[PDB]
Amino acid sequence: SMWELTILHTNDVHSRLEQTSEDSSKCVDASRCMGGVARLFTKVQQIRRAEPNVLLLDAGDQYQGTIWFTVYKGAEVAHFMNALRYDAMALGNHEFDNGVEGLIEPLLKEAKFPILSANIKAKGPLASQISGLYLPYKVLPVGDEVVGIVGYTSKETPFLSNPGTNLVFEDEITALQPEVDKLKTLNVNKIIALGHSGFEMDKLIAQKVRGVDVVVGGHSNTFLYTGNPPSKEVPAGKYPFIVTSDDGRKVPVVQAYAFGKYLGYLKIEFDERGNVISSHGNPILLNSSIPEDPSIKADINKWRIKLDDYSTQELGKTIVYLDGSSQSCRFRECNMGNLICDAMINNNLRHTDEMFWNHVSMCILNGGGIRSPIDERNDGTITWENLAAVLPFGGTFDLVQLKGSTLKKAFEHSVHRYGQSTGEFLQVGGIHVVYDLSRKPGDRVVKLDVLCTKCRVPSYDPLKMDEVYKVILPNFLANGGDGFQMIKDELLRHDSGDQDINVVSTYISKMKVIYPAVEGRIKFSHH
Amino acid sequence: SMWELTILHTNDVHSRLEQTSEDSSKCVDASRCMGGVARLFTKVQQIRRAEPNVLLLDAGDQYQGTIWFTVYKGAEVAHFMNALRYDAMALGNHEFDNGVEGLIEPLLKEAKFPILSANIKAKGPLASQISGLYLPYKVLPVGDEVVGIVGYTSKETPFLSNPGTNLVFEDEITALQPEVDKLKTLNVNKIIALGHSGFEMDKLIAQKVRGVDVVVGGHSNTFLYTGNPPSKEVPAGKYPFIVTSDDGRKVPVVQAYAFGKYLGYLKIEFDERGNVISSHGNPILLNSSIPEDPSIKADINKWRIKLDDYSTQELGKTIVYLDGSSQSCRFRECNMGNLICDAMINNNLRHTDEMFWNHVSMCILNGGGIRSPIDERNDGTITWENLAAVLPFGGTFDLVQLKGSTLKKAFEHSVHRYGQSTGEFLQVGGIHVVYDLSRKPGDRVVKLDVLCTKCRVPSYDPLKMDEVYKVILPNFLANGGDGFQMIKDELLRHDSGDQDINVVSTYISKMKVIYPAVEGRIKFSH
Ligand SMILES: CN(c1nc(Cl)nc2c1nnn2[C@@H]1O[C@H](COP(=O)(O)CP(=O)(O)O)[C@@H](O)[C@H]1O)[C@H]1C=Cc2ccccc21
Ligand SMILES: CN(c1nc(Cl)nc2c1nnn2[C@@H]1O[C@H](COP(=O)(O)CP(=O)(O)O)[C@@H](O)[C@H]1O)[C@H]1C=Cc2ccccc21
Ligand SMILES: *[C@@H]1O[C@H](CO)[C@@H](O)[C@H](O)[C@H]1NC(C)=O
Ligand SMILES: *[C@@H]1O[C@H](CO)[C@@H](O)[C@H](O)[C@H]1NC(C)=O
Ligand SMILES: [Ca+2]
Ligand SMILES: [Ca+2]
Ligand SMILES: [Zn+2]
Ligand SMILES: [Zn+2]
Ligand SMILES: [Zn+2]
Ligand SMILES: [Zn+2]
């Protein structure tokens, strides 16, 4: 016979428990808001009532994003994922942001669904302490059939989070294969690979892991769609994306963007042996047509009260849209990058006591460190809550002494694989850079002018490779993050500075009204 | 017979009563300071004791420049020019800044030397009131000889100051020639033209006014030197500058820069008929080698106490040199222009209740309205006094609505006669302009991008001729000044804003530490 399975899936929700603006930022105009767990429940329940065979799965990065996680630390994730009745979750990189303890105690011990990762192996005293709290797979009953779900997590988690020294993140394909093999031997013939490594790993898993029928992914915030997409996000492929495997099968690969804006919806048709005959669907845009569930909403409002202490005090006003979108700040000059770098520079010049850094005028900032926009409509108020979503990583803005050559290398690294929405793209201050993307990686920086320090009047002069420059940047960059190894290995001095979010709030309070522009600090040429 | 005269001269002192930094701003490091009336007195007296026949002349613009003029309103000029025992003064355009009563009551009634201009004609009730308080000439005895001094004043004075409608500024040459001829018939064979119209007009006068022996000038802040100059000022020619006149004579033309930094010094050798045989000299740099005279210095300090109210409160700090120099802000982007425009823009966004201008992001500012730098050395303090010398005109920063086409025409006017250190050169905010000076005047702007207002994220888009733009600018520019007639004629709305010096102090008090850069707002291409 035929056997139909509906996979409903979310990924990279990133602490967006409440409904959001179109662009993921705080909801202001309720009529045009989107996502949030209350709306998501309504739609999930609409599908479950109409189709007998449904799994609702999460591909990780529920942790970290808003003051929801700052205050509740994963308890909100356990609680509201339980209310939605998720069948399964793959662990993501952000599930390690409060260490292993911060994963165990709030989420793994409270979740009423299996949490999965087959490539994470525990070692030392931790092995027995966490044994079973997450599994390599789970076999779930769905009607009269069983469906195997096998988990995986990005092996870049040690560089993006705090998983500690007692977890080993194995290569995904190598770890998955014996588990999918195990399940086949246990006559589990339908197998879903659920995990958090990116669209490109997902296609490889689909290609290389024999026995996997569907791949449900995350980490790259990938939007896939078939036909005319319903919002501002531009499709990266069809939904589902069809990989032709190494063993002659057609493996559908799915993802559902980010921030709870869409519920993925894939209908698979299986044969009696568990081969995929076909599949179809699309992500469902969770727009204001779908009501928020009253019960979930009311429960969100109860949890909300403790968060309102982060939104009482207006820090200041923006009269412009502060564009902290992934699609701006990882691809080109973005005015939120500018605001942050100027804030960094401005705040550092107050510390007059420390005379070495008292004329620092140059700044660099990883695009991937800017995590949300802030909207200017409705008086463009800026609260702590709004800032916390732009800067959730609790970092510092540190001061480094760098060679011109080191800095030149950083600017090449910034665009070395340009076009894949990766976070190493640098927003700046006191620096005018020009990239020519038709040139080879490592040779795309064609102009690099920085504010002089030796001069009485600051002006943008060409960077010289044997000169030394003083620069304010996140400690993440200072310690070699986003693969900026040259910064870490080659810097001449590194000083701790102030906490990132205090720096920017301090700027906003001082300025009262802000209005950062896209000024031409980062340009692209063709010559 | 040979008769030697030494002409000592100043022009465009611009209220620099006290000694100053090299760049004309407030003195801070006294070891390196220059100018001031106390130092000038020491050098004048050194020359008077060596040279028997001496005239000390001023070619105008003593008025306006520092808190000396704000507070004492010209009384300081009369007083200290009297103590230096000036022989005569020509009226300059800034001598009319507080109107005719501001000229009459402090300077003309207290000056113990003749004050001169031959091309200013009084008409109506003023004529009898001002009769004899200024003269077209004076005949000064100098030993057993006499020297006639004939005055002139820029006929741009009506566009640059407040002379009123009862004074008529005649063409210089047409006014001077009858006076010089009159003096000849009066047996005055030695004649000095002392006046305030510019080096170019000075040269014309030399060329065309028969009977003039020397021209002593001002207004253009011109530096002449014969040899290796002593400081940053680049000579525009020899001192004296020799004009070969239409009647076959050599006529030396002299100016001495500005800000009391130099005392002009020219020894003329005349024959028995008052024809110049030879002249030689140079401006003397009034640096700290020359001591300040103890008495004039002590008297300055007595007058100084009323001014210390303007320097007691630090407003903030600059960690960069704030380049308000003529030579930067009239020729290229200068960081003081940028400071002032950013203050203009910033301060205006405070006014939240007025919704029409609350996104204004575009500023234009005449370079000539920026009047002094501010130094960053010794913790770069900024006081009202420092600011008062950057912006001594008392204007407002106003809001206009302009067609792109009007603004495009403004930026063409900005560089139409570029290279002559004129004040119409525009400093800017929210504007990226690029000029090609090889192109024809009226066609030199090859790129003009301005911040969008309709957009949600501000970015620099190319200006559109038929779109409309909201711009903050000096009221001087809104009202047509500096030749920007298109602004006055073509603006669609014009609203009064806040007082200029207030705007910039408020911004500095808010910022605490400022660091304006030259960013590429104004660029030159080939
Ligand atoms: C402080 N940390 C960080 N600090 C900043 Cl300042 N920036 C970061 C950070 N870690 N990642 N990033 C930036 O985000 C990009 C990836 O985003 P996505 O491509 O969207 C996939 P994701 O959704 O899993 O984060 C990267 O390239 C970066 O540009 C990390 C590093 C250690 C750690 C320990 C505990 C907690 C957080 C952290
Ligand atoms: C407010 N007013 C002004 N406001 C600004 Cl905001 N700027 C000005 C002004 N008048 N002139 N300028 C600028 O100065 C330039 C010449 O300098 P110089 O070439 O150095 C020869 P000077 O030394 O005689 O002034 C020009 O081009 C301009 O760029 C003038 C206009 C009427 C009036 C009445 C009473 C008092 C002052 C004023
Ligand atoms: C939600 O999306 C559908 C199509 O995807 C559209 O027809 C509907 O108008 C949308 N609702 C809004 C904008 O509230
Ligand atoms: C004053 O000027 C002369 C050159 O004109 C120079 O020899 C002397 O040392 C100067 N004094 C200074 C800079 O103190
Ligand atoms: Ca199968
Ligand atoms: Ca003669
Ligand atoms: Zn994520
Ligand atoms: Zn992730
Ligand atoms: Zn002058
Ligand atoms: Zn003048």
UniProtKB/Swiss-Prot annotation, chain B:
GO terms for cellular component: cell surface; cytosol; external side of plasma membrane; extracellular exosome; membrane; nucleoplasm; plasma membrane. Inhibited by adenosine 5'-(alpha,beta-methylene)-diphosphate (AMPCP). Glycans are attached at residues 29, 287, 309, 379. Its cofactor is Zn(2+). Zn(2+) 2 binds at residues 12, 61, 93, 196, 219. It catalyses: a ribonucleoside 5'-phosphate + H2O = a ribonucleoside + phosphate; a 2'-deoxyribonucleoside 5'-phosphate + H2O = a 2'-deoxyribonucleoside + phosphate; dTMP + H2O = thymidine + phosphate; CMP + H2O = cytidine + phosphate. Changing residue 334 to Y: In CALJA; absence from the plasma-membrane; exhibits no catalytic AMPase activity. Keywords: Cell membrane, Disease variant, Disulfide bond, Glycoprotein, GPI-anchor, Hydrolase, Lipoprotein, Membrane, Metal-binding, Nucleotide-binding, Signal, Zinc. It is a lipid-anchor; GPI-anchor. AMP binds at residues 330, 366, 371, 393, 476, 482. A lipid is attached at residue 525 (GPI-anchor amidated serine). It is found in: Cell membrane. It is linked to Calcification of joints and arteries: A condition characterized by adult-onset calcification of the lower extremity arteries, including the iliac, femoral and tibial arteries, and hand and foot capsule joints. Age of onset has been reported as early as the second decade of life, usually involving intense joint pain or calcification in the hands. Homodimer. This is 5'-nucleotidase. The gene is NT5E.
